[PDB]
A and B are shown apart, each in its own frame.
With several copies, the nearest count.
Chain A
Amino acid sequence: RDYEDELQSERDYVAGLYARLDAERAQSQRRYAAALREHGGTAVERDAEVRALAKDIARLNVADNGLCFGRLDTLDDARLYIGRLGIFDRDNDFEPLLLDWRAPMARPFYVATAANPENMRRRRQFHTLGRKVVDFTDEILGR
Chain B
Amino acid sequence: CYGRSMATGKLVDIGEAVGIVAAQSIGEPGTQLTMRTFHQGGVTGGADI
For residue B46, give the distance in angstroms from its CB to the closest CB of chain A. 11
* Residues in chain A near residue B37, CB distance under 8 A: 51
* Residues in chain B near residue A58, CB distance under 8 A: 47-48
B24 at the interface (CB under 8 A from A): no
Interface string of B24-46 (1 = CB under 8 A from A): 00000000001101000000000
Residues 54-84 of A at the B interface (beta carbon under 8 Å):
54-55, 58
A20 at the interface (CB under 8 A from B): no
Residues 99-124 of A at the B interface (beta carbon under 8 Å):
none
Interface size of A in residues (CB-CB distance below 8 Å) = 8
A36 at the interface (CB under 8 A from B): yes
CB atoms of B47 and A36 under 8 A apart: no
CB atoms of B34 and A55 under 8 A apart: no
A6 at the interface (CB under 8 A from B): no
Q: CB-nearest residue of chain A relative to B32?
A: A43
CB atoms of B35 and A54 under 8 A apart: no
For residue B45, give the distance in angstroms from its CB to the closest CB of chain A. 9
Q: Which of A36, A47, A55 is close to B35, meaning CB atoms less than 8 Å apart?
A: A47
A46 at the interface (CB under 8 A from B): yes
Q: CB-nearest residue of chain B relative to A46?
A: B34
* Residues in chain B near residue A47, CB distance under 8 A: 34-35
* Residues in chain B near residue A54, CB distance under 8 A: 48-49
* Residues in chain B near residue A51, CB distance under 8 A: 37, 48
Interface positions of A (Cβ within 8 A of B): 36, 46-47, 50-51, 54-55, 58
Interface positions of B (Cβ within 8 A of A): 34-35, 37, 47-49
* A–B pairs, 9, beta carbons within 8 Å: A36-B34, A46-B34, A50-B34, A51-B37, A54-B48, A54-B49, A55-B48, A58-B47, A58-B48
